[PDB]
Amino acid sequence: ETIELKRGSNSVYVQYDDIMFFESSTKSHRLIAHLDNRQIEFYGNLKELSQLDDRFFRCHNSFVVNRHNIESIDSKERIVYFKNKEHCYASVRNVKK
DNA sequence: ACAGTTAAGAAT
DNA sequence: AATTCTTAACTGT
């Protein structure tokens, strides 16, 4: 299961479970794939990534998480912790799901 | 329910 | 390829 992260003249190819989560970049129409120890900026939209696979869940407007790489959830604070020790946030309306 | 912020379409 | 404007739909309380 591999995904092509398109970057204009380049592409980077990554396995689904290399990915902790995706977040929107502050560069318009770019996302950031968070991997174990690297981050890769690419062209995409979050909606499309969440439809690739059941493991990819839109927990927030700005985040798509890989369920397989979740270490724990603090549902009080709405913080999703990943196996590489990063974290991101779940929205009030999506945290339960 | 609100006001502030943002993802993503379209065009090029 | 990379960028802008736009706006509905998101955000947290």
Short mmCIF file of C-alpha atoms (C1' of nucleotides) in Angstrom, two decimals:
data_model
loop_
_atom_site.label_atom_id
_atom_site.label_comp_id
_atom_site.label_asym_id
_atom_site.label_seq_id
_atom_site.Cartn_x
_atom_site.Cartn_y
_atom_site.Cartn_z
CA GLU A 1 0.00 0.00 0.00
CA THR A 2 1.90 2.98 -1.29
CA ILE A 3 0.97 6.57 -1.81
CA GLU A 4 2.52 9.01 -4.25
CA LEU A 5 3.15 12.40 -2.67
CA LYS A 6 3.25 14.72 -5.70
CA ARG A 7 5.60 17.69 -5.47
CA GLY A 8 5.53 19.41 -8.88
CA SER A 9 8.64 18.16 -10.71
CA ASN A 10 9.26 15.52 -7.96
CA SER A 11 7.31 12.73 -6.39
CA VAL A 12 7.99 10.86 -3.18
CA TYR A 13 6.59 7.37 -2.60
CA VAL A 14 5.72 6.29 0.93
CA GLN A 15 3.94 3.34 2.55
CA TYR A 16 0.66 3.97 4.34
CA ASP A 17 2.09 2.92 7.69
CA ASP A 18 5.19 5.12 7.34
CA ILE A 19 2.68 7.94 7.91
CA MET A 20 1.61 9.11 11.38
CA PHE A 21 -0.61 11.91 10.09
CA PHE A 22 -1.13 14.52 7.43
CA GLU A 23 -1.70 18.18 8.15
CA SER A 24 -2.37 21.23 6.02
CA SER A 25 0.69 23.30 5.24
CA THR A 26 0.55 27.08 5.55
CA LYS A 27 1.51 26.97 1.84
CA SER A 28 -1.84 27.00 0.07
CA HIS A 29 -2.86 23.59 -1.39
CA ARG A 30 0.04 21.82 0.21
CA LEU A 31 -0.05 19.21 2.91
CA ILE A 32 2.63 17.79 5.16
CA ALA A 33 3.03 14.07 5.64
CA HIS A 34 4.49 13.32 9.07
CA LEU A 35 6.59 10.22 8.97
CA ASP A 36 8.63 8.64 11.82
CA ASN A 37 11.55 11.14 11.63
CA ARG A 38 10.87 13.16 8.44
CA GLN A 39 8.17 15.47 7.12
CA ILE A 40 7.34 15.73 3.43
CA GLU A 41 5.51 18.62 1.86
CA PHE A 42 3.30 17.82 -1.14
CA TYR A 43 0.26 18.79 -3.21
CA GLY A 44 -2.98 17.33 -2.10
CA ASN A 45 -6.13 17.83 -0.15
CA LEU A 46 -7.13 16.14 3.08
CA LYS A 47 -10.56 14.98 1.90
CA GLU A 48 -9.00 12.74 -0.77
CA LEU A 49 -6.60 11.16 1.71
CA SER A 50 -9.35 10.22 4.18
CA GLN A 51 -11.11 8.29 1.37
CA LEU A 52 -8.00 6.23 0.49
CA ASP A 53 -8.41 3.83 3.41
CA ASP A 54 -10.33 3.18 6.63
CA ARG A 55 -7.17 3.71 8.69
CA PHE A 56 -7.03 7.36 7.54
CA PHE A 57 -9.42 9.40 9.62
CA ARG A 58 -10.32 13.06 9.41
CA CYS A 59 -10.15 13.94 13.16
CA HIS A 60 -10.06 17.71 12.53
CA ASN A 61 -10.45 20.13 9.62
CA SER A 62 -6.63 20.40 9.46
CA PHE A 63 -5.58 16.78 10.24
CA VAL A 64 -5.86 13.29 8.83
CA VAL A 65 -4.48 10.65 11.17
CA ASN A 66 -3.35 7.12 10.53
CA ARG A 67 -5.25 4.96 13.11
CA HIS A 68 -2.56 2.27 12.88
CA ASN A 69 0.02 4.70 14.24
CA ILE A 70 -2.02 6.12 17.11
CA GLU A 71 -0.39 5.38 20.51
CA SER A 72 -3.06 7.00 22.71
CA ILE A 73 -5.87 9.50 22.89
CA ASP A 74 -6.45 12.07 25.60
CA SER A 75 -10.14 12.71 24.82
CA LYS A 76 -10.45 15.30 27.63
CA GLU A 77 -7.80 17.54 26.03
CA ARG A 78 -8.58 16.06 22.52
CA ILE A 79 -4.94 15.15 21.83
CA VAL A 80 -3.93 12.24 19.62
CA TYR A 81 -0.49 10.84 20.40
CA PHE A 82 1.44 8.88 17.82
CA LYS A 83 3.99 6.09 18.10
CA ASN A 84 6.82 8.45 17.03
CA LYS A 85 5.88 10.83 19.93
CA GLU A 86 4.29 13.53 17.78
CA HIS A 87 0.80 14.61 18.52
CA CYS A 88 -2.05 16.51 16.89
CA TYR A 89 -5.57 17.64 17.86
CA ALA A 90 -9.01 16.28 17.31
CA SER A 91 -11.90 18.68 16.91
CA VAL A 92 -14.80 18.80 19.36
CA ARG A 93 -17.18 17.47 16.71
CA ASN A 94 -14.97 14.55 15.52
CA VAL A 95 -13.17 13.43 18.69
CA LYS A 96 -15.78 10.81 19.67
CA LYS A 97 -15.52 9.09 16.24
"C1'" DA B 1 -25.35 30.57 18.01
"C1'" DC B 2 -21.55 33.19 17.23
"C1'" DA B 3 -17.29 35.28 15.02
"C1'" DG B 4 -12.89 34.05 13.52
"C1'" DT B 5 -10.21 30.99 10.64
"C1'" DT B 6 -9.22 27.82 6.84
"C1'" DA B 7 -9.48 23.87 3.10
"C1'" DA B 8 -10.00 23.47 -1.36
"C1'" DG B 9 -12.17 24.78 -6.16
"C1'" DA B 10 -11.13 26.91 -10.26
"C1'" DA B 11 -8.15 29.12 -13.49
"C1'" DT B 12 -3.85 29.69 -15.45
"C1'" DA C 1 3.95 24.11 -11.80
"C1'" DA C 2 2.68 27.34 -8.26
"C1'" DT C 3 -0.07 30.79 -7.11
"C1'" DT C 4 -4.22 33.95 -6.18
"C1'" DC C 5 -8.81 34.95 -4.79
"C1'" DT C 6 -12.92 33.29 -2.84
"C1'" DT C 7 -16.25 31.34 0.31
"C1'" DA C 8 -18.81 27.54 2.63
"C1'" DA C 9 -17.77 25.04 6.20
"C1'" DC C 10 -15.12 24.47 9.64
"C1'" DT C 11 -13.22 25.99 14.78
"C1'" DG C 12 -13.99 26.28 20.21
"C1'" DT C 13 -16.68 27.82 23.72
#
